[model samples]
Target: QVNNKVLMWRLLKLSRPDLPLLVAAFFFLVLAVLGETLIPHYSGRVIDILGGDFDPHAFASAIFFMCLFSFGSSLSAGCRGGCFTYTMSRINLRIREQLFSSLLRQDLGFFQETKTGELNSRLSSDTTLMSNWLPLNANVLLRSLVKVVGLYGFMLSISPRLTLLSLLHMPFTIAAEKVYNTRHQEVLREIQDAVARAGQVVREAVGGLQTVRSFGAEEHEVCRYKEALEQCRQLYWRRDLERALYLLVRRVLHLGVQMLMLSCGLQQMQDGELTQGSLLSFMIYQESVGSYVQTLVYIYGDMLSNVGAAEKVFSYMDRQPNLPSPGTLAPTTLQGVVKFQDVSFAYPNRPDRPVLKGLTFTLRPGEVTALVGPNGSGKSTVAALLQNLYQPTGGQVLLDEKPISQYEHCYLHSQVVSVGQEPVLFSGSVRNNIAYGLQSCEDDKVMAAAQAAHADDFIQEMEHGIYTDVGEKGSQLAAGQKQRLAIARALVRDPRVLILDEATSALDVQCEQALQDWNSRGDRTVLVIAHRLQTVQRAHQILVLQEGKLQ
Candidate 1:
């Protein structure tokens, strides 16, 4: 219980800015309940007055006062509902921003281990559930609580015996709510996971629509999606069935209370302890109490589900990256001297299988070196370590004679750029994709980098030139064009160290020649990984790796 209170308080802190508004709304909610409860009191008074003497003036005054209370109740309800909804919207927006920022701080391995669609599912659905629940459930729970308390007070004042008779099933209702919440929360979590899985399948299918069509596996994809959806449907059906059963049990308890109240009220009336008008009021207040209790049960169940969803969200928000920090050094210049001093590594998922074992090598500043090897020889892993994408499990990688961890991550990345085997581009203009990370670069500079990579001519031939939109992942461009454009992206940074992993394999002879020309013109350090020996023969040094060891 203490932990739950802490978790709920953490979620509420996100909406601290809107707390004043929410507080005011709650005040109005209390007023609304009070105004509503007064109606029954005056209603009973009117019935008693009519029974005694037909005083038209007194009856008219009572009717007028009841109308006044009704109007005030309506006004308070409107203001409270509107203000709370607006405050909740702002809170939800803030929560999304925080979730997105937390995701950005996670390391590269986090992305590799987590699916894109699943991450997106947390951001889209989990946050929505948590953000909506805090304010909405709080509002309902508070309103119902106030209404129940006020109505019960009036019921007791009319006749204590009847009030006790009406509340006989209270303990049973409380116990049932507790049991329902536990089971409902468990089922809700399962339902959420199933829905997210189904969403992931759809996302993958749409993103790879071309691949699906090429393989003529449309039916296969459909069945895969259908299977996921069927699982989700089953979980949802089970949840609804549980909800229906709980509702039925709650109604049965409420009806039992009503029957007891009616039987006791009739007995008291016959004993001259209660008047007809007072009996009428007692019945009305009992009904109100029953309704409010039912509302509270629903609110409590919904709040429990939201608490579960909030836990999932806070798990991500509170996660700390495994990478250590506090290096504090942001070098103004890097000489591009990179060394792998007996470095060894194994992927986190496959700890038993080492990828690089005691691999020692160096690429001097202003020199070009090659890492030549066969498949599964850790060539790509070397590039990843060089780019700080992964840390060596044993030994260390260094830049400019200091441990890579000693330099600020952003500064080190700015000085050491890498282009992977399969180039990726976001859905944006060609100019934007090429000049992605640079603080500032002119149009002429962007074109210069493009020309150096032999991408200028084709880009110019396109209708929109540099401004043309490259569909998602640069699907609008050919494979070779994507590679050259990737080279241009690296060139614009003008980094001191450049690592290319089969970057030229997709390029045509002309583009490759253009890259070789650019390579010869720069004094920057280059680490090229390739299978073809001829490509690295001109390098200053060459190291061959095989079976996770340098051959």
Candidate 2:
């Protein structure tokens, strides 16, 4: 509960820049409520005047003032509504930017542990929910509060006895709303989860269209998605039914309260204890109070629903990466001497199952060291640790004899580059994918790297050469073609130390020879993680691993 308060406070603080607009809107809202509240008094005054000695000029003047107040109320409401809508839109935009920025800076493990579709849902659906609730519902809450307060004051002024009776059932109303809200919040959370799961189903099916077609599981996936949607529909139905019942009960209670007030006040009128106009005013105030209470109850329910969304959003925004902060040390030059000294690790999700244990090895300057191991022998884990993707649970990885963590992240990545087994490509031209890491690149430089990787021939054969769209994840290219382009991507950086983990597996002997010639350059150091004996033989030195131990 304390944490929820802090999160809500932080959310409000995000709107600090637009506080002036919000304040102005609030002032206008008060004016609007004030004007509306005055109308009931005007009606009572006109009634009293008409019942007693009526005056034409006085009645005309009273009507004129009521119309004037009505016009002012309408104008104030228009400004208030417009201002709040504008302020909330800006606040939503700011929150989204902050969420995306924080997510981007988070460690790689966060992405691994969290689902893509879930994060998407938070950024889209949850953000909209929370953002809309804060400014919009806040406005409604304030308006209802002002109306209730003003109406009660007038009710008490007209007849304190009747005012006390009107409020007799309020405690019950509040308690009932609290009970309903608790269950409604639970339903809202379930609905959010079901919707996110449904989106995940579609995202997965669309992303793996070829695999789905190959396996002929279209109908199966459809049924899976249908189940998720059906769950959501059921939850919505339950919530709607619950709401209808609550509304009926609350409205009945409201009617009972009004009846009690009418019966008691009519007796007072019959006994000559109250005037007809005064009794009429008291009933009008009672009606306004009832409406305000109902509106406030709905607003309370909405805020409860928003609480769930706020918690989800604040959880991510407030997350601290388990990894250390990026280092400030950026050397002018790096000699590319990489070493793993007694390194050990396990993924955070499965800490009991160690993936790497007491591994020690070094790649000297300008030397090609090959890491050969069977699958699940921690070959890929070593590459990830080298790239600073994961922190070593024991020991450390060094670059030029200094802990890799001591070097600035951007600087280290620029110097020591790695091409993974399955490379990722953005939805852009082939040239952009190759030049992704670098801030800028020349056309000739991109083509030269492509030529070195023997990708120049294939790229030239395409209609647009290096400018061809690769589609999403380089879908336009085949596996071998994507592999070659990925190699070219790594080569384009002209990195001092290049780690290729089966990067050239898809290439033929001729292309492999061309890549070997490219690696033959005197200044470059290479670490190759390969399974093919022929490829390992080409390395200057080969270290074999079995069960995370170096041999």
Candidate 3:
């Protein structure tokens, strides 16, 4: 219970950014409720005047006040709704940005374990549900409470005896709310997870269309998703049915209270203790009081269920990334000597099953070191560790005698570049693609790097309107062309160290010599993962490995 309160308090704190808007909206809310409360009060006055002495001034004044507040309440309510809605929109945008920032900074393992669809749904759907916590839920809660109290005051002012009898529905409605709130929240959570899975199914289907089409499993995917949606609909239908039962309880209790109130008031009126006009006014007040009480409970019920969404969002927002803290080492110069000492690694999925065991190697500046291995030889794990994407289970990786984790993340990445066999092409200019990570790249540097990778010829062809729009993924550039562009991408960094994992396979005979020329420039260090004998023999030093071993 205390945990829920903490969550609610945190959500309210997020609303602090829109405090001025809330204060204004709250003022308008009070005005609207005040107008609503006055309508019934003055309505009783108009009734009393009509019952006996029809004074034109009294009747006119009473009728005039009722009409005035009715219009005023409607106007203020409109502005109040407008303000709250605008505040909700801004909160959604801000919260989504905050969530995305947190997700991006988390360790690579988190992404490996979590599906893209789940994260995307949290950002798209759950954030909106959380955004409603302050503006809509709290607004309705405060509005209903104020209206209920205001009506209570007017009802008691007319006759305290009848007001007490009218409130017999309160205990019953509160009991129903207690029951509904728990089950509803549990169902909502299940629905949220199910919906996230449904989204995952669609994303996997669309994003892997090539695999889906090749397997001839479109109908299989269609059935898989239909069941997902079918489960969601069943949950929805059952929840609505339970809601109907809850509503029936409120109605029966409401009817019972009104029946008793009327009977007692009749006896008092017959004994000349109350006027018909006052009795009529008291009935009107009870009707609204009963409704406001139910609405108050309903708002709370909805808020508690929506808090399920809030819990999920806050859980992600509060998650500290499992990766190491940002290191403070950013140097203007580097020798770029990398070393792995007795390194052993295990994937997080199975920490006991060591994949890369007892490895030792050194990469020196102005030297080309090729790592030659067969399949399942853990070469990819070595590259991931070098990129600082994962930490080794045992032993440490060092750069210039300092642990790799000790180097500033951006500085380390900018210094040591990696190009894999398959490179991702993003939407941007061909020039911009070559200069992806840098803050700025001059045309000279871009062209120079492009020339080194032997991509200048192809890019210049695109520059003449062949396919300059790098955003056009539709054109399907040849594997080698894309490989050349990716090589240019790393080359533009002018990195102190370049790590190539089987990327040389796509470098054709024309640029096979370009690789040697780039190698002759001994200012940069190189590490290559190779299977071909030509690449291994060309290396300044070659390291051979068996499965997780050198022998």
Candidate 4:
């Protein structure tokens, strides 16, 4: 509902190009309907003629045309199906691409305020549900309206008295359906909410599996999960109970309509106003039209549900970024000449608690600067800003005497790489992980970078050396090994500004010494975020951060 107009406009814009195809589809659907309508009439006419002096030639001609019309309808239906499929698929692809691209363009504050799991769900499940608007809503709405109207007209043309009598019970059915709809919606909302809560808990449990295991929370986790699952089940049970009661009443109404139509149809036949063939054709037409209406009701419910899902999908995509980049341009070199000039920032949710106030510092090009601070001292915040992961609330990041916002993110990132204190490695072979981003990486360069990080020895000893596959999140290797691999990846990029945020914190003294010595040789500037004395001493300059200010 929030982005209804904008989303609708986007959907229409995408569909506008297929005007010709849409027109053709409408024409074909009409042909199919007309062809179907004629079959009954043709059969009725033949039977009436046969009762007297039957004309073989005329009968043969009518049969041929009826077959021709059926063939035309079939052809049109096929074309419409293909067209609908292609158009809907294209819409889904564009939505997915746009969703991802927009997310990447958003500033860091957006990510801080959101969760990756929620964003992932929107892009995958929500966007997918939204795509059904065209295929299910637009397609069904159009075809059903056309068929219902067209068939009703033909039936009226055949016998108006019987047609009116057949539809007398329809109003009651509609009224009952309205009552059921109100109850159905109330129950379904509760069910959906419960399921979402359960999904969130499962996601949390999976992400913190190691933490849970180490804390011996196996039973606790299971119990927590069971509770969430049970809540979801209960919500579904409530909805299902209501749905069954409504369905029972709705079915009875449907049966009543069929019986009334049959009784009236038999009366018309007995009065000699309708023949045997006419009665048969009319019965089939009534059934066809009735089925069409039932399908429309079913699809309409799904369409309404999808509309609700689409709102969630569009909420984040439509949000205006909290931290917007400056209009002035910055250089792409990202030469590590970062100056935090009178900077200040506060957390969005906790604005009263300012995290940084007038924090001033200079990180010279080709110089290794270390930021040391106590807990919540804004050291990590500085690292995040330097990498362009988040923008400062007040102040500018200058690169080569220009604001950093001017440079494209991809271009800026190529020259700057940050290794987090807790690095993440994908599941793959050592060679594959090393060669993940860059194509055509030389083996010698990879090995040299590994050797620089003190990981080459361990890497070569793996089951298949560098070719050995690491399990999920590099579970096959030690925590320190994953950090070294992350370091190697940063080195592989040959960045101008390298950041080591506690990269060697977990390793022993020898590995720390090896890392310090290896880093001393690189011409690239480095910013080390470390609490340990061994890694901290390697910095050429140290800035002690306290209470958001550099001392």
Q: lDDT by residue for model 2 over 214-286, one digit each (tens)? A: 9786998898988988888898899899999999999999889888989989988888877887888787777
What tens digits encode model 4's per-residue C-alpha lDDT throughout 18-97?
A: 67766776676676676667777788777766776779998888788878877887887887777777767777888898
Sliding window of 10 residues with minimal summed lDDT for model 4: 326-335
Model 1, global lDDT: 0.82
Error of 4 at 474 (Å): 2.2
Global lDDT scores for all candidate models: 0.82, 0.82, 0.80, 0.74
Instruction: State the local distance difference test value for candidate 3.
Output: 0.80
- What TM-score should be assigned to candidate 3? 0.79
User: Candidate 3, residues 1-551: lDDT per residue as tens digits?
Assistant: 66777888888887788889999999999999988878766766777788865699888888878888899999999999999999999999998888888877888787888899988888889989888778877687889899988888888888777877876667876787788878888888887888898899999998998999997879998999999999888888877888888889878877888899999899888888777777888888887676667787678657666676688878988987778777888779798888889998889955787877878988878778888877475677778889889988899998888888988888899988888767777777676677888888577777787788887787666654223555465245677878888888887787888887676566674564465557423677788887766685568988887777764
> TM-score: which candidate is best?
3
The better candidate by lDDT, 1 or 4, is 1
Which candidate, 1 or 4, would have the higher TM-score against the true structure? 1
Which candidate, 1 or 2, would have the higher TM-score against the true structure? 1
Clashing pairs in 2: none
TM-score of each: 0.77, 0.75, 0.79, 0.71
Candidate 2: list runs displaced more than 4 Å. Answer: 1-4, 41-67, 153-282, 293-306, 375-377, 442-444, 458-468, 519-521
Model 1 CA deviation exceeding 4 Å by range: 1-6, 13-17, 48-60, 156-279, 294-306, 375-377, 519-521
Better of 2 and 3 by lDDT: 2
- Writing each residue's lDDT as its tens digit, candidate 1 over 323-371 gives 7674767878767677888899888756788887788987787677887
RMSD of 2: 9.4
Worst-scoring 10-residue span by lDDT in model 2:
513-522
